[PDB]
Design a binder for this molecule. Structure first.
Ligand SMILES: [Ca+2]
Length: 769
């Protein structure tokens, strides 16, 4: 491994061997069907709202999120990088597809598959990933740096459906070597969204953009139809000329064939035929190839950039709505712009590398923080692009100034912006893309007073319930199977209109977004103020016994739905107290004295009653009326956690909060599998896990990271990082369960999981306040 010195991979990059087998992998722990795409994953490519492409550590383009809201795991075997190498003096060279595997069926059988084990490494520190290729049969060593321009405070490049592959080649031997690098890509128009004739009309063309000191050669893979539909658009691959390399290409090879039409050319001398052919296909799958070839002398290094783009302008949801994706603002809407996107990338990628370095450097240069924490912090951000992200630039048909945004809870529970989950999981957005965050909260503000009196069947018990009640904040902003943004509360497993936690969380999210963007945006507080007042007022009506706190009813009425709360709970109670104190402060800022005095009076009566009902000398009781009332809940003081972030001071005494957190560490962390798997939700005071519900026996990964940040702000540094380490270990480490780039909601003590690719563990960014 001499190639690693010639590139700059950071020490905190997650690492694994190409073709490595992982034996300890976790699986779903529920009865009902659930996504398990295996441990063969990698860092995604593509911007926010663009659709994403997961290229795995084995090299394959396998996890397809190009249909917005859907997860489709299947390797498109034609999509590869391949290498030819020939030492001078030798009669024949050697060709190899850089993929640790082979096709299932007989297509592309002529290609050299099965990249051998122990001959290269994969590295990832999102948005960057790397592959090194160190093979005894290949005297020249190769490496590639791949990424998309995911850049905080940038809402432009961050939206781009593009990826750059920056190759580096070095000759450590004492002989000249001829080398070629080839990018192949299938014309994937019709991969999704086309009901019949899936390849019909697909055709490939070659663009040669000649100019002074900048030759670009690219394949544009599109369709002869100009229909403005979900399925129609273009893919493009290409490369930029550099000193010392020649470019060659093949416009059309058959992907539904043995591939020797391409491979007989490449395997001979690493040079393609330069055959243009715009003939449309009927049933055969087609693809394009772009190759560079060059001669490396002993000790010579050379660098060459390839790129990939996809112009698929329209996203369609199952309810019928068609929207334009965000990137169309900068490239157009007609779906004929893939070359323009590719060109932009090939000419500006170095500026993008530096911009990515600029935002990662403040954390990476901090030597007080361990590498493992940095690994988790950056790589958890994968989900912002991979979470079925929807970011609209006009409805098809239809002008407006705001661009609506949605991030899925996950793919098993296909709900956009689930409010509970984004309470924990929206920290990266508020901290790194605050204009998206504020847009999402305005979307919620506009739904507060929506009344939908039509009745739906509740999934858990079969009872009938009203869809959306006036003054109650929605559970979610729709599903990709139906109508995101337009039809809210797609969730039907419980009735969220009776929930005691969502209205409080909403108000806390509003004040968080004011506080964490500099306490400057009065216009935002102005816009949300009436919804905030309405949210707290409706929740006050649920106070039955008149202690100033809404009563949990012993039935599903908060996010830990099946782990039943009754009376005053520590969870909803603390959130209620924090929400009231946040609303006081908004009242002061907007000079709404009536509201200030009201929410101040409610706060004082509730604070007093919360402490009297729940404080037990060591921690705060789960609730006042359940059979598991004295359980130690990991999330018991969630309101105080947010109160620290929002700079609202003490809602509860400092001494009591410190004892409560120490107890959670002593029990929920350290007595659950030696503190190596995070904080289990519920533990009994005797030291055994609360078995009253499945949710109590689960570690929730986002809750554990949030708890770690709470510990961190309260000076409990060892406890914070030790608590968070178990989540890192399980996700990323060789002794974990193989959840890298699909961090789940939860696992049980055996390490098996519920709901991979989950939003909540983005809460790790709460540790960077
Ligand atoms: Ca009450």
């Amino acid at each position: 491994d001499k190639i690693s010195h010639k590139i700059d991979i950071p020490d905190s990059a997650w690492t694994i061997g190409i073709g490595e087998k992982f034996k300890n992998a976790g699986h779903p722990n529920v009865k009902y069907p659930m996504i398990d795409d295996s441990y063969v994953q990698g860092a995604p490519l593509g911007g926010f709202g663009a659709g994403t492409i997961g290229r795995t550590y084995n090299g394959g383009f396998s996890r397809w999120h190009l249909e917005i809201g859907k997860n489709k795991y299947t390797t498109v075997y034609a999509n590869q990088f391949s290498v030819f190498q020939k030492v001078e003096g030798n009669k024949d060279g050697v060709a190899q597809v850089l993929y640790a595997g082979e096709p299932e069926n007989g297509y592309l059988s002529s290609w050299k598959w099965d990249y051998p084990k122990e001959s290269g490494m994969y590295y990832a520190l999102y948005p960057n990933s790397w592959y090194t290729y160190t093979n005894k049969d290949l005297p020249v060593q190769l490496a590639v740096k791949q990424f998309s321009p995911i850049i905080p405070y940038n809402y432009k490049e961050t939206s781009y459906p593009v990826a750059v592959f920056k190759w580096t080649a070095y000759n450590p031997t004492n002989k000249n070597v001829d080398v070629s690098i080839m990018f192949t890509w299938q014309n994937m128009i019709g991969f999704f969204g086309k009901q019949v004739n899936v390849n019909s009309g697909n055709f490939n063309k070659i663009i040669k953009d000649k100019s002074k000191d900048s030759e670009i050669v690219a394949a544009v893979m599109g369709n002869i139809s100009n229909d403005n539909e979900e399925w129609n658009g273009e893919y493009s691959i290409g490369v930029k000329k550099v000193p010392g390399v020649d470019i060659s290409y093949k416009a059309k090879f058959v992907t539904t064939g043995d591939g020797s039409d391409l491979w007989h050319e490449f395997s001979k001398n690493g040079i393609l035929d330069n055959k243009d052919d715009e003939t449309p296909t009927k049933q055969d799958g087609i693809g394009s190839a772009i190759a560079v070839n060059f001669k490396l002398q002993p000790g010579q290094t050379i660098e060459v950039p390839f790129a990939l783009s996809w112009d698929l302008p329209i996203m369609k949801f199952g309810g019928g709505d068609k929207w334009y994706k965000m990137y169309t603002k900068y490239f157009g809407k007609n779906g004929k712009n893939s070359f323009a996107i590719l060109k932009e990338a090939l000419n500006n990628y170095q500026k993008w590398e530096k911009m990515i370095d600029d935002w990662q450097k403040p954390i990476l240069s901090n030597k007080s923080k361990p590498d493992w924490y940095k690994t988790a912090l950056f790589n958890e951000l994968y989900y912002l692009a991979d979470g079925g992200t929807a970011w609209e630039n006009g409805k098809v048909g239809e002008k407006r100034t705001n661009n609506m945004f949605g991030l899925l809870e996950c793919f098993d529970y296909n709900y956009y912006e689930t409010l509970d989950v984004r309470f924990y999981g929206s920290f990266p957005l508020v901290m790194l893309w605050p204009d998206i965050e504020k847009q999402v909260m305005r979307q919620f503000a506009d739904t507060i007073n929506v009344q939908d009196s039509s009745e739906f069947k509740v999934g858990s018990n079969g009872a009938m319930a009203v869809k959306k009640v006036q003054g109650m904040i929605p559970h979610d902003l729709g599903s990709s199977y139906a109508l995101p943004w337009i039809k809210i509360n797609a969730y039907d497993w419980q009735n969220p209109n009776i929930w005691k936690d969502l209205n409080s969380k909403y108000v806390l999210l509003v004040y968080r977004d004011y506080v964490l963007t500099g306490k400057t945006d009065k216009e935002f507080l102005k816009y949300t103020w009436k919804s905030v007042k309405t949210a707290l007022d409706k929740l006050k009506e649920m106070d039955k016994d008149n202690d100033g706190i809404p009563d949990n009813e012993g039935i599903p009425d908060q996010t830990y739905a099946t782990w039943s709360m009754k009376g005053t709970s520590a969870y909803c109670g603390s959130l209620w107290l924090a929400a009231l104190k946040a609303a006081q402060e908004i009242g002061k800022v907007l000079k709404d004295n009536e509201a200030y005095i009201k929410y101040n009076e409610w706060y004082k009566i509730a604070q007093q009653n919360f402490e009297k009902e729940l404080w037990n000398g060591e921690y705060y009781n789960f609730d006042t009326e359940s059979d598991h009332k004295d359980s130690i809940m990991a999330d018991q003081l969630a309101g105080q956690w947010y109160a620290d972030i929002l700079r609202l001071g003490d809602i509860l005494p400092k001494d009591h909060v410190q004892k409560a957190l120490k107890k959670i560490y002593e029990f929920n962390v350290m007595k659950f599998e030696n503190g190596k798997m995070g904080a289990v939700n519920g533990m009994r005071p005797d030291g055994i896990v609360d078995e009253s519900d499945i949710q109590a026996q689960e570690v929730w990964t986002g809750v554990t990271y949030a708890l770690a940040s709470f510990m961190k702000y309260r000076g409990m540094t060892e406890e914070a990082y030790n608590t968070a380490y178990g989540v890192y270990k399980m996700t990323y480490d060789k002794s974990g369960k193989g959840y890298w780039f699909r961090t789940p909601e939860a696992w049980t003590k055996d390490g098996n999981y519920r709901a991979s690719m989950y939003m909540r563990p983005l809460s790790i960014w709460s540790m960077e306040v």
